[PDB]
Amino acid sequence: EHDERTHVPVELRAAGVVLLNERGDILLVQEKGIEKAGLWHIPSGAVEDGENPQDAAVREACEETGLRVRPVKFLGAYLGRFPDGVLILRHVWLAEPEPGQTLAPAFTDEIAEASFVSREDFAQLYAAGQIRMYQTKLFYADALREKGFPALPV
Amino acid sequence: EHDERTHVPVELRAAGVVLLNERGDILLVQEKGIEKAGLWHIPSGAVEDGENPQDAAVREACEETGLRVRPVKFLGAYLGRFPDGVLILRHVWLAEPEPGQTLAPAFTDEIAEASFVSREDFAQLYAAGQIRMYQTKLFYADALREKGFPALPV
């Protein structure tokens, strides 16, 4: 790695989880509106400057869904750029919920609700253009493979 | 996250580890030349397209140092750009070696050797400009804090 390269500053970092239950259903969060319903995405939030992204993913998951989760394995990170040029690096971990918990979403001006969705219904949501970031499907597929669950309908 | 942003393709991904032993010494790999000795960096290597970065970090660590390591916690990822415009995302995990192992570096045209360096000597190497990527110091400091070890000399 002695080949020279310049630094590309990333101003924002987000961290979230692909949380699967025992049946392979995925936990998703729904936006509050856009007659159209809000789109769905994984539990995720901003990583404070200097804080560990993995810890942030766990914190954000709890804040949005009310569930305490355990990070199991890092799945990946991808880069986006806002119109003003700001870069955001999104991090995703495969996670599992701690036992004996009840889903209790934090309803805000940004979150309408959160819930577990089956593989089959997720496929319908995706085909219907209801998954905000298509990367959710890519990471869900990764998670299913890791946990040994059946692949998404196809 | 309903705010629109474009995708910024990252062509290359690398994964490595900040591997600390029981004393808080860090495992570093030395380049083969540049009368000047090669610089030092963490065990790290290319993530194959499609393969899990965390698994790659573990694989690369073993390939370069001969040590089987266990990923403990994700520390962070940062972005670089080669002169031709290619982006590379480097991933770093805090790792621990499996018990009862002997350091046996893989000597190649790129690696002269690998070894454990103490906090105090690392500080000297850094001040001397012998650490290829300054991010190594940032992540080493992160690792020391995580493991409850004393901070680097200062």
Side-chain angles (χ1 to χ4, degrees), chain B residues 72-110:
Chain B
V72 178
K73 185 176 186 176
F74 175 78
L75 295 181
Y78 61 99
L79 191 67
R81 189 187 297 282
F82 289 106
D84 61 6
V86 170
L87 288 178
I88 179 167
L89 182 65
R90 292 175 57 75
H91 311 241
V92 182
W93 277 267
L94 164 62
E96 296 178 358
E98 298 194 310
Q101 287 183 286
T102 307
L103 184 57
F107 311 121
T108 66
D109 295 65
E110 296 295 64

PDB file of all heavy atoms in Angstrom, chain B residues 72-110:
ATOM      1  N   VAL B  72     -12.667  -8.641  16.989  1.00  0.00           N
ATOM      2  CA  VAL B  72     -13.332  -8.301  18.239  1.00  0.00           C
ATOM      3  C   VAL B  72     -14.354  -7.182  18.087  1.00  0.00           C
ATOM      4  O   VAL B  72     -15.451  -7.253  18.640  1.00  0.00           O
ATOM      5  CB  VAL B  72     -12.292  -7.887  19.306  1.00  0.00           C
ATOM      6  CG1 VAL B  72     -12.990  -7.496  20.595  1.00  0.00           C
ATOM      7  CG2 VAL B  72     -11.319  -9.031  19.553  1.00  0.00           C
ATOM      8  N   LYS B  73     -13.995  -6.149  17.333  1.00  0.00           N
ATOM      9  CA  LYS B  73     -14.886  -5.017  17.144  1.00  0.00           C
ATOM     10  C   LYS B  73     -14.431  -4.168  15.969  1.00  0.00           C
ATOM     11  O   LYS B  73     -13.234  -3.993  15.746  1.00  0.00           O
ATOM     12  CB  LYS B  73     -14.901  -4.172  18.420  1.00  0.00           C
ATOM     13  CG  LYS B  73     -15.883  -3.012  18.422  1.00  0.00           C
ATOM     14  CD  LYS B  73     -15.875  -2.316  19.777  1.00  0.00           C
ATOM     15  CE  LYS B  73     -16.949  -1.244  19.860  1.00  0.00           C
ATOM     16  NZ  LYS B  73     -17.003  -0.642  21.221  1.00  0.00           N
ATOM     17  N   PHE B  74     -15.391  -3.654  15.211  1.00  0.00           N
ATOM     18  CA  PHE B  74     -15.091  -2.795  14.073  1.00  0.00           C
ATOM     19  C   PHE B  74     -14.650  -1.452  14.636  1.00  0.00           C
ATOM     20  O   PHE B  74     -15.302  -0.915  15.535  1.00  0.00           O
ATOM     21  CB  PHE B  74     -16.351  -2.593  13.234  1.00  0.00           C
ATOM     22  CG  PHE B  74     -16.178  -1.633  12.094  1.00  0.00           C
ATOM     23  CD1 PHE B  74     -15.536  -2.024  10.926  1.00  0.00           C
ATOM     24  CD2 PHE B  74     -16.685  -0.341  12.179  1.00  0.00           C
ATOM     25  CE1 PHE B  74     -15.409  -1.142   9.854  1.00  0.00           C
ATOM     26  CE2 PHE B  74     -16.562   0.546  11.113  1.00  0.00           C
ATOM     27  CZ  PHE B  74     -15.926   0.142   9.952  1.00  0.00           C
ATOM     28  N   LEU B  75     -13.552  -0.910  14.120  1.00  0.00           N
ATOM     29  CA  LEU B  75     -13.066   0.378  14.592  1.00  0.00           C
ATOM     30  C   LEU B  75     -13.438   1.512  13.643  1.00  0.00           C
ATOM     31  O   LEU B  75     -13.825   2.592  14.084  1.00  0.00           O
ATOM     32  CB  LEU B  75     -11.547   0.336  14.797  1.00  0.00           C
ATOM     33  CG  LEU B  75     -11.069  -0.622  15.894  1.00  0.00           C
ATOM     34  CD1 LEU B  75      -9.551  -0.565  16.018  1.00  0.00           C
ATOM     35  CD2 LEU B  75     -11.726  -0.246  17.220  1.00  0.00           C
ATOM     36  N   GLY B  76     -13.326   1.274  12.342  1.00  0.00           N
ATOM     37  CA  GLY B  76     -13.673   2.316  11.398  1.00  0.00           C
ATOM     38  C   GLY B  76     -13.216   2.035   9.987  1.00  0.00           C
ATOM     39  O   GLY B  76     -12.530   1.053   9.725  1.00  0.00           O
ATOM     40  N   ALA B  77     -13.620   2.909   9.075  1.00  0.00           N
ATOM     41  CA  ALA B  77     -13.256   2.800   7.673  1.00  0.00           C
ATOM     42  C   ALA B  77     -12.977   4.211   7.178  1.00  0.00           C
ATOM     43  O   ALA B  77     -13.589   5.174   7.645  1.00  0.00           O
ATOM     44  CB  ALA B  77     -14.397   2.176   6.874  1.00  0.00           C
ATOM     45  N   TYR B  78     -12.028   4.343   6.261  1.00  0.00           N
ATOM     46  CA  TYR B  78     -11.707   5.651   5.707  1.00  0.00           C
ATOM     47  C   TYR B  78     -11.426   5.527   4.218  1.00  0.00           C
ATOM     48  O   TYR B  78     -11.065   4.455   3.723  1.00  0.00           O
ATOM     49  CB  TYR B  78     -10.553   6.309   6.470  1.00  0.00           C
ATOM     50  CG  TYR B  78      -9.249   5.564   6.437  1.00  0.00           C
ATOM     51  CD1 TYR B  78      -8.242   5.934   5.550  1.00  0.00           C
ATOM     52  CD2 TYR B  78      -8.999   4.516   7.321  1.00  0.00           C
ATOM     53  CE1 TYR B  78      -7.012   5.289   5.548  1.00  0.00           C
ATOM     54  CE2 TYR B  78      -7.773   3.861   7.326  1.00  0.00           C
ATOM     55  CZ  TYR B  78      -6.782   4.256   6.441  1.00  0.00           C
ATOM     56  OH  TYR B  78      -5.550   3.644   6.472  1.00  0.00           O
ATOM     57  N   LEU B  79     -11.580   6.646   3.525  1.00  0.00           N
ATOM     58  CA  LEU B  79     -11.490   6.702   2.078  1.00  0.00           C
ATOM     59  C   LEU B  79     -10.299   7.420   1.465  1.00  0.00           C
ATOM     60  O   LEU B  79      -9.927   8.519   1.884  1.00  0.00           O
ATOM     61  CB  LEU B  79     -12.785   7.338   1.580  1.00  0.00           C
ATOM     62  CG  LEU B  79     -13.162   7.347   0.107  1.00  0.00           C
ATOM     63  CD1 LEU B  79     -13.434   5.923  -0.364  1.00  0.00           C
ATOM     64  CD2 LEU B  79     -14.407   8.207  -0.073  1.00  0.00           C
ATOM     65  N   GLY B  80      -9.725   6.792   0.444  1.00  0.00           N
ATOM     66  CA  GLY B  80      -8.588   7.358  -0.259  1.00  0.00           C
ATOM     67  C   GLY B  80      -8.832   7.338  -1.755  1.00  0.00           C
ATOM     68  O   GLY B  80      -9.694   6.596  -2.245  1.00  0.00           O
ATOM     69  N   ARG B  81      -8.080   8.150  -2.490  1.00  0.00           N
ATOM     70  CA  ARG B  81      -8.231   8.213  -3.936  1.00  0.00           C
ATOM     71  C   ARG B  81      -6.873   8.193  -4.614  1.00  0.00           C
ATOM     72  O   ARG B  81      -6.006   9.020  -4.323  1.00  0.00           O
ATOM     73  CB  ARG B  81      -8.981   9.486  -4.352  1.00  0.00           C
ATOM     74  CG  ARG B  81      -9.370   9.497  -5.831  1.00  0.00           C
ATOM     75  CD  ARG B  81      -9.951  10.832  -6.279  1.00  0.00           C
ATOM     76  NE  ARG B  81     -11.203  11.204  -5.618  1.00  0.00           N
ATOM     77  CZ  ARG B  81     -12.402  10.706  -5.913  1.00  0.00           C
ATOM     78  NH1 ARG B  81     -12.548   9.789  -6.863  1.00  0.00           N
ATOM     79  NH2 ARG B  81     -13.473  11.163  -5.273  1.00  0.00           N
ATOM     80  N   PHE B  82      -6.682   7.237  -5.513  1.00  0.00           N
ATOM     81  CA  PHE B  82      -5.427   7.137  -6.238  1.00  0.00           C
ATOM     82  C   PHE B  82      -5.389   8.245  -7.296  1.00  0.00           C
ATOM     83  O   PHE B  82      -6.420   8.846  -7.619  1.00  0.00           O
ATOM     84  CB  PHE B  82      -5.307   5.745  -6.869  1.00  0.00           C
ATOM     85  CG  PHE B  82      -5.072   4.658  -5.860  1.00  0.00           C
ATOM     86  CD1 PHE B  82      -6.087   3.769  -5.512  1.00  0.00           C
ATOM     87  CD2 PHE B  82      -3.842   4.555  -5.215  1.00  0.00           C
ATOM     88  CE1 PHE B  82      -5.879   2.798  -4.533  1.00  0.00           C
ATOM     89  CE2 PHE B  82      -3.626   3.590  -4.237  1.00  0.00           C
ATOM     90  CZ  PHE B  82      -4.649   2.707  -3.894  1.00  0.00           C
ATOM     91  N   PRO B  83      -4.199   8.538  -7.844  1.00  0.00           N
ATOM     92  CA  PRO B  83      -4.073   9.589  -8.859  1.00  0.00           C
ATOM     93  C   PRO B  83      -5.020   9.439 -10.045  1.00  0.00           C
ATOM     94  O   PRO B  83      -5.479  10.435 -10.606  1.00  0.00           O
ATOM     95  CB  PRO B  83      -2.604   9.492  -9.272  1.00  0.00           C
ATOM     96  CG  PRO B  83      -1.939   9.071  -8.000  1.00  0.00           C
ATOM     97  CD  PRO B  83      -2.876   7.992  -7.490  1.00  0.00           C
ATOM     98  N   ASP B  84      -5.318   8.200 -10.425  1.00  0.00           N
ATOM     99  CA  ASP B  84      -6.204   7.960 -11.557  1.00  0.00           C
ATOM    100  C   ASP B  84      -7.687   8.121 -11.239  1.00  0.00           C
ATOM    101  O   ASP B  84      -8.535   7.940 -12.115  1.00  0.00           O
ATOM    102  CB  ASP B  84      -5.941   6.574 -12.167  1.00  0.00           C
ATOM    103  CG  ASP B  84      -6.174   5.435 -11.188  1.00  0.00           C
ATOM    104  OD1 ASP B  84      -6.655   5.678 -10.062  1.00  0.00           O
ATOM    105  OD2 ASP B  84      -5.874   4.278 -11.558  1.00  0.00           O
ATOM    106  N   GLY B  85      -7.998   8.467  -9.992  1.00  0.00           N
ATOM    107  CA  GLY B  85      -9.385   8.666  -9.604  1.00  0.00           C
ATOM    108  C   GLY B  85     -10.037   7.503  -8.882  1.00  0.00           C
ATOM    109  O   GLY B  85     -11.134   7.642  -8.343  1.00  0.00           O
ATOM    110  N   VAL B  86      -9.370   6.354  -8.857  1.00  0.00           N
ATOM    111  CA  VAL B  86      -9.924   5.178  -8.192  1.00  0.00           C
ATOM    112  C   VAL B  86     -10.036   5.373  -6.683  1.00  0.00           C
ATOM    113  O   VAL B  86      -9.089   5.822  -6.039  1.00  0.00           O
ATOM    114  CB  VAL B  86      -9.057   3.922  -8.469  1.00  0.00           C
ATOM    115  CG1 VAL B  86      -9.495   2.769  -7.573  1.00  0.00           C
ATOM    116  CG2 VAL B  86      -9.176   3.518  -9.941  1.00  0.00           C
ATOM    117  N   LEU B  87     -11.197   5.036  -6.132  1.00  0.00           N
ATOM    118  CA  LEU B  87     -11.428   5.143  -4.699  1.00  0.00           C
ATOM    119  C   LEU B  87     -11.156   3.815  -4.005  1.00  0.00           C
ATOM    120  O   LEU B  87     -11.468   2.741  -4.532  1.00  0.00           O
ATOM    121  CB  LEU B  87     -12.873   5.548  -4.403  1.00  0.00           C
ATOM    122  CG  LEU B  87     -13.311   6.982  -4.695  1.00  0.00           C
ATOM    123  CD1 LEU B  87     -14.789   7.122  -4.374  1.00  0.00           C
ATOM    124  CD2 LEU B  87     -12.492   7.961  -3.865  1.00  0.00           C
ATOM    125  N   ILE B  88     -10.569   3.893  -2.818  1.00  0.00           N
ATOM    126  CA  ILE B  88     -10.305   2.704  -2.025  1.00  0.00           C
ATOM    127  C   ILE B  88     -10.807   2.943  -0.604  1.00  0.00           C
ATOM    128  O   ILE B  88     -10.490   3.959   0.022  1.00  0.00           O
ATOM    129  CB  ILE B  88      -8.795   2.333  -2.016  1.00  0.00           C
ATOM    130  CG1 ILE B  88      -8.565   1.086  -1.156  1.00  0.00           C
ATOM    131  CG2 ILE B  88      -7.962   3.505  -1.516  1.00  0.00           C
ATOM    132  CD1 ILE B  88      -7.195   0.466  -1.333  1.00  0.00           C
ATOM    133  N   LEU B  89     -11.623   2.015  -0.114  1.00  0.00           N
ATOM    134  CA  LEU B  89     -12.163   2.120   1.235  1.00  0.00           C
ATOM    135  C   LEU B  89     -11.449   1.096   2.108  1.00  0.00           C
ATOM    136  O   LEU B  89     -11.557  -0.111   1.875  1.00  0.00           O
ATOM    137  CB  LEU B  89     -13.676   1.851   1.225  1.00  0.00           C
ATOM    138  CG  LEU B  89     -14.422   1.971   2.557  1.00  0.00           C
ATOM    139  CD1 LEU B  89     -14.374   3.408   3.063  1.00  0.00           C
ATOM    140  CD2 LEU B  89     -15.863   1.531   2.356  1.00  0.00           C
ATOM    141  N   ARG B  90     -10.705   1.594   3.092  1.00  0.00           N
ATOM    142  CA  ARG B  90      -9.965   0.743   4.021  1.00  0.00           C
ATOM    143  C   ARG B  90     -10.780   0.514   5.289  1.00  0.00           C
ATOM    144  O   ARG B  90     -11.286   1.464   5.889  1.00  0.00           O
ATOM    145  CB  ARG B  90      -8.614   1.384   4.366  1.00  0.00           C
ATOM    146  CG  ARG B  90      -7.645   1.427   3.186  1.00  0.00           C
ATOM    147  CD  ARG B  90      -6.352   2.168   3.529  1.00  0.00           C
ATOM    148  NE  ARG B  90      -5.672   1.581   4.683  1.00  0.00           N
ATOM    149  CZ  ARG B  90      -4.989   0.441   4.663  1.00  0.00           C
ATOM    150  NH1 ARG B  90      -4.874  -0.256   3.540  1.00  0.00           N
ATOM    151  NH2 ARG B  90      -4.438  -0.012   5.780  1.00  0.00           N
ATOM    152  N   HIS B  91     -10.910  -0.750   5.689  1.00  0.00           N
ATOM    153  CA  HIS B  91     -11.678  -1.131   6.878  1.00  0.00           C
ATOM    154  C   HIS B  91     -10.729  -1.658   7.947  1.00  0.00           C
ATOM    155  O   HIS B  91      -9.798  -2.406   7.635  1.00  0.00           O
ATOM    156  CB  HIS B  91     -12.686  -2.240   6.548  1.00  0.00           C
ATOM    157  CG  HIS B  91     -13.525  -1.975   5.334  1.00  0.00           C
ATOM    158  ND1 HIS B  91     -14.900  -1.884   5.378  1.00  0.00           N
ATOM    159  CD2 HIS B  91     -13.181  -1.834   4.033  1.00  0.00           C
ATOM    160  CE1 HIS B  91     -15.366  -1.702   4.154  1.00  0.00           C
ATOM    161  NE2 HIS B  91     -14.344  -1.668   3.320  1.00  0.00           N
ATOM    162  N   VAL B  92     -10.987  -1.303   9.203  1.00  0.00           N
ATOM    163  CA  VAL B  92     -10.133  -1.722  10.306  1.00  0.00           C
ATOM    164  C   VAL B  92     -10.916  -2.290  11.484  1.00  0.00           C
ATOM    165  O   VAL B  92     -11.887  -1.686  11.951  1.00  0.00           O
ATOM    166  CB  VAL B  92      -9.277  -0.529  10.809  1.00  0.00           C
ATOM    167  CG1 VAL B  92      -8.347  -0.983  11.929  1.00  0.00           C
ATOM    168  CG2 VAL B  92      -8.484   0.060   9.651  1.00  0.00           C
ATOM    169  N   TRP B  93     -10.486  -3.464  11.943  1.00  0.00           N
ATOM    170  CA  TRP B  93     -11.079  -4.141  13.095  1.00  0.00           C
ATOM    171  C   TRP B  93     -10.051  -4.317  14.188  1.00  0.00           C
ATOM    172  O   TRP B  93      -8.865  -4.501  13.913  1.00  0.00           O
ATOM    173  CB  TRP B  93     -11.549  -5.556  12.742  1.00  0.00           C
ATOM    174  CG  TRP B  93     -12.882  -5.634  12.118  1.00  0.00           C
ATOM    175  CD1 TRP B  93     -14.077  -5.833  12.749  1.00  0.00           C
ATOM    176  CD2 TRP B  93     -13.178  -5.445  10.737  1.00  0.00           C
ATOM    177  NE1 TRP B  93     -15.105  -5.774  11.838  1.00  0.00           N
ATOM    178  CE2 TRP B  93     -14.579  -5.534  10.595  1.00  0.00           C
ATOM    179  CE3 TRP B  93     -12.395  -5.205   9.602  1.00  0.00           C
ATOM    180  CZ2 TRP B  93     -15.215  -5.390   9.358  1.00  0.00           C
ATOM    181  CZ3 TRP B  93     -13.025  -5.062   8.373  1.00  0.00           C
ATOM    182  CH2 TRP B  93     -14.422  -5.154   8.263  1.00  0.00           C
ATOM    183  N   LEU B  94     -10.520  -4.256  15.426  1.00  0.00           N
ATOM    184  CA  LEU B  94      -9.678  -4.534  16.576  1.00  0.00           C
ATOM    185  C   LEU B  94      -9.723  -6.059  16.562  1.00  0.00           C
ATOM    186  O   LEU B  94     -10.797  -6.645  16.389  1.00  0.00           O
ATOM    187  CB  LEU B  94     -10.329  -4.014  17.858  1.00  0.00           C
ATOM    188  CG  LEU B  94      -9.751  -4.554  19.171  1.00  0.00           C
ATOM    189  CD1 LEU B  94      -8.287  -4.152  19.305  1.00  0.00           C
ATOM    190  CD2 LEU B  94     -10.568  -4.023  20.342  1.00  0.00           C
ATOM    191  N   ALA B  95      -8.574  -6.704  16.714  1.00  0.00           N
ATOM    192  CA  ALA B  95      -8.535  -8.158  16.704  1.00  0.00           C
ATOM    193  C   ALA B  95      -7.611  -8.689  17.785  1.00  0.00           C
ATOM    194  O   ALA B  95      -6.773  -7.963  18.322  1.00  0.00           O
ATOM    195  CB  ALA B  95      -8.083  -8.662  15.338  1.00  0.00           C
ATOM    196  N   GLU B  96      -7.789  -9.965  18.101  1.00  0.00           N
ATOM    197  CA  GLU B  96      -6.977 -10.638  19.100  1.00  0.00           C
ATOM    198  C   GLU B  96      -6.498 -11.946  18.489  1.00  0.00           C
ATOM    199  O   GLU B  96      -7.222 -12.590  17.727  1.00  0.00           O
ATOM    200  CB  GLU B  96      -7.804 -10.904  20.359  1.00  0.00           C
ATOM    201  CG  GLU B  96      -8.266  -9.631  21.044  1.00  0.00           C
ATOM    202  CD  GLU B  96      -9.130  -9.887  22.260  1.00  0.00           C
ATOM    203  OE1 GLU B  96      -9.412 -11.067  22.560  1.00  0.00           O
ATOM    204  OE2 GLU B  96      -9.529  -8.899  22.913  1.00  0.00           O
ATOM    205  N   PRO B  97      -5.260 -12.351  18.799  1.00  0.00           N
ATOM    206  CA  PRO B  97      -4.756 -13.601  18.233  1.00  0.00           C
ATOM    207  C   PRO B  97      -5.294 -14.814  18.974  1.00  0.00           C
ATOM    208  O   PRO B  97      -5.592 -14.739  20.166  1.00  0.00           O
ATOM    209  CB  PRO B  97      -3.250 -13.462  18.397  1.00  0.00           C
ATOM    210  CG  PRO B  97      -3.142 -12.727  19.697  1.00  0.00           C
ATOM    211  CD  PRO B  97      -4.210 -11.657  19.568  1.00  0.00           C
ATOM    212  N   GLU B  98      -5.444 -15.927  18.266  1.00  0.00           N
ATOM    213  CA  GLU B  98      -5.895 -17.143  18.920  1.00  0.00           C
ATOM    214  C   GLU B  98      -4.689 -17.559  19.757  1.00  0.00           C
ATOM    215  O   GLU B  98      -3.548 -17.274  19.393  1.00  0.00           O
ATOM    216  CB  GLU B  98      -6.237 -18.227  17.897  1.00  0.00           C
ATOM    217  CG  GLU B  98      -7.368 -17.850  16.959  1.00  0.00           C
ATOM    218  CD  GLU B  98      -7.917 -19.042  16.203  1.00  0.00           C
ATOM    219  OE1 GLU B  98      -7.116 -19.795  15.609  1.00  0.00           O
ATOM    220  OE2 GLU B  98      -9.152 -19.224  16.201  1.00  0.00           O
ATOM    221  N   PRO B  99      -4.922 -18.230  20.891  1.00  0.00           N
ATOM    222  CA  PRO B  99      -3.836 -18.667  21.772  1.00  0.00           C
ATOM    223  C   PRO B  99      -2.847 -19.682  21.197  1.00  0.00           C
ATOM    224  O   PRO B  99      -3.157 -20.417  20.259  1.00  0.00           O
ATOM    225  CB  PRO B  99      -4.584 -19.219  22.982  1.00  0.00           C
ATOM    226  CG  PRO B  99      -5.829 -19.775  22.367  1.00  0.00           C
ATOM    227  CD  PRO B  99      -6.227 -18.677  21.409  1.00  0.00           C
ATOM    228  N   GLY B 100      -1.647 -19.692  21.775  1.00  0.00           N
ATOM    229  CA  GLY B 100      -0.605 -20.620  21.371  1.00  0.00           C
ATOM    230  C   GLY B 100      -0.117 -20.561  19.937  1.00  0.00           C
ATOM    231  O   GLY B 100       0.012 -21.598  19.283  1.00  0.00           O
ATOM    232  N   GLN B 101       0.168 -19.362  19.441  1.00  0.00           N
ATOM    233  CA  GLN B 101       0.650 -19.217  18.074  1.00  0.00           C
ATOM    234  C   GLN B 101       2.012 -18.556  17.985  1.00  0.00           C
ATOM    235  O   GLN B 101       2.403 -17.779  18.854  1.00  0.00           O
ATOM    236  CB  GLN B 101      -0.338 -18.414  17.237  1.00  0.00           C
ATOM    237  CG  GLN B 101      -1.598 -19.157  16.875  1.00  0.00           C
ATOM    238  CD  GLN B 101      -2.496 -18.329  15.989  1.00  0.00           C
ATOM    239  OE1 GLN B 101      -3.133 -17.377  16.447  1.00  0.00           O
ATOM    240  NE2 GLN B 101      -2.536 -18.672  14.710  1.00  0.00           N
ATOM    241  N   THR B 102       2.721 -18.868  16.906  1.00  0.00           N
ATOM    242  CA  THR B 102       4.044 -18.320  16.660  1.00  0.00           C
ATOM    243  C   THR B 102       4.006 -17.407  15.442  1.00  0.00           C
ATOM    244  O   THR B 102       3.459 -17.770  14.406  1.00  0.00           O
ATOM    245  CB  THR B 102       5.065 -19.435  16.374  1.00  0.00           C
ATOM    246  OG1 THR B 102       5.027 -20.406  17.427  1.00  0.00           O
ATOM    247  CG2 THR B 102       6.465 -18.854  16.269  1.00  0.00           C
ATOM    248  N   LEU B 103       4.584 -16.221  15.571  1.00  0.00           N
ATOM    249  CA  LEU B 103       4.628 -15.279  14.465  1.00  0.00           C
ATOM    250  C   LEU B 103       5.515 -15.862  13.366  1.00  0.00           C
ATOM    251  O   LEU B 103       6.666 -16.224  13.615  1.00  0.00           O
ATOM    252  CB  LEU B 103       5.195 -13.944  14.952  1.00  0.00           C
ATOM    253  CG  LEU B 103       5.256 -12.770  13.972  1.00  0.00           C
ATOM    254  CD1 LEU B 103       3.871 -12.469  13.415  1.00  0.00           C
ATOM    255  CD2 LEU B 103       5.812 -11.552  14.694  1.00  0.00           C
ATOM    256  N   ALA B 104       4.969 -15.972  12.158  1.00  0.00           N
ATOM    257  CA  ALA B 104       5.699 -16.514  11.014  1.00  0.00           C
ATOM    258  C   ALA B 104       5.279 -15.727   9.775  1.00  0.00           C
ATOM    259  O   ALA B 104       4.466 -16.193   8.973  1.00  0.00           O
ATOM    260  CB  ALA B 104       5.377 -18.000  10.837  1.00  0.00           C
ATOM    261  N   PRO B 105       5.835 -14.521   9.603  1.00  0.00           N
ATOM    262  CA  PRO B 105       5.518 -13.649   8.465  1.00  0.00           C
ATOM    263  C   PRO B 105       5.769 -14.274   7.097  1.00  0.00           C
ATOM    264  O   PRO B 105       6.656 -15.117   6.933  1.00  0.00           O
ATOM    265  CB  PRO B 105       6.409 -12.430   8.701  1.00  0.00           C
ATOM    266  CG  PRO B 105       6.630 -12.435  10.188  1.00  0.00           C
ATOM    267  CD  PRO B 105       6.846 -13.896  10.470  1.00  0.00           C
ATOM    268  N   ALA B 106       4.980 -13.847   6.115  1.00  0.00           N
ATOM    269  CA  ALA B 106       5.116 -14.332   4.747  1.00  0.00           C
ATOM    270  C   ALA B 106       5.963 -13.326   3.976  1.00  0.00           C
ATOM    271  O   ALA B 106       5.461 -12.299   3.518  1.00  0.00           O
ATOM    272  CB  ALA B 106       3.742 -14.475   4.099  1.00  0.00           C
ATOM    273  N   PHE B 107       7.247 -13.631   3.838  1.00  0.00           N
ATOM    274  CA  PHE B 107       8.190 -12.759   3.146  1.00  0.00           C
ATOM    275  C   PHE B 107       7.973 -12.759   1.638  1.00  0.00           C
ATOM    276  O   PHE B 107       8.121 -13.785   0.974  1.00  0.00           O
ATOM    277  CB  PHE B 107       9.617 -13.196   3.477  1.00  0.00           C
ATOM    278  CG  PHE B 107       9.857 -13.396   4.947  1.00  0.00           C
ATOM    279  CD1 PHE B 107      10.265 -14.633   5.436  1.00  0.00           C
ATOM    280  CD2 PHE B 107       9.647 -12.355   5.848  1.00  0.00           C
ATOM    281  CE1 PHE B 107      10.460 -14.832   6.802  1.00  0.00           C
ATOM    282  CE2 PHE B 107       9.837 -12.542   7.215  1.00  0.00           C
ATOM    283  CZ  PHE B 107      10.245 -13.786   7.693  1.00  0.00           C
ATOM    284  N   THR B 108       7.626 -11.592   1.108  1.00  0.00           N
ATOM    285  CA  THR B 108       7.370 -11.434  -0.319  1.00  0.00           C
ATOM    286  C   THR B 108       8.060 -10.181  -0.838  1.00  0.00           C
ATOM    287  O   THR B 108       8.821  -9.537  -0.119  1.00  0.00           O
ATOM    288  CB  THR B 108       5.868 -11.291  -0.595  1.00  0.00           C
ATOM    289  OG1 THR B 108       5.399 -10.060  -0.028  1.00  0.00           O
ATOM    290  CG2 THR B 108       5.101 -12.455   0.017  1.00  0.00           C
ATOM    291  N   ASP B 109       7.780  -9.832  -2.089  1.00  0.00           N
ATOM    292  CA  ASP B 109       8.373  -8.644  -2.686  1.00  0.00           C
ATOM    293  C   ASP B 109       7.771  -7.385  -2.073  1.00  0.00           C
ATOM    294  O   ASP B 109       8.251  -6.279  -2.313  1.00  0.00           O
ATOM    295  CB  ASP B 109       8.150  -8.644  -4.200  1.00  0.00           C
ATOM    296  CG  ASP B 109       8.864  -9.788  -4.894  1.00  0.00           C
ATOM    297  OD1 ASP B 109       8.511 -10.958  -4.639  1.00  0.00           O
ATOM    298  OD2 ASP B 109       9.784  -9.516  -5.694  1.00  0.00           O
ATOM    299  N   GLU B 110       6.724  -7.562  -1.271  1.00  0.00           N
ATOM    300  CA  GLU B 110       6.046  -6.439  -0.628  1.00  0.00           C
ATOM    301  C   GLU B 110       6.188  -6.431   0.893  1.00  0.00           C
ATOM    302  O   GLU B 110       6.029  -5.390   1.529  1.00  0.00           O
ATOM    303  CB  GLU B 110       4.560  -6.448  -0.991  1.00  0.00           C
ATOM    304  CG  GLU B 110       4.268  -6.232  -2.470  1.00  0.00           C
ATOM    305  CD  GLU B 110       4.677  -4.853  -2.953  1.00  0.00           C
ATOM    306  OE1 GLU B 110       5.887  -4.542  -2.924  1.00  0.00           O
ATOM    307  OE2 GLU B 110       3.788  -4.077  -3.362  1.00  0.00           O
TER     308      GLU B 110
END
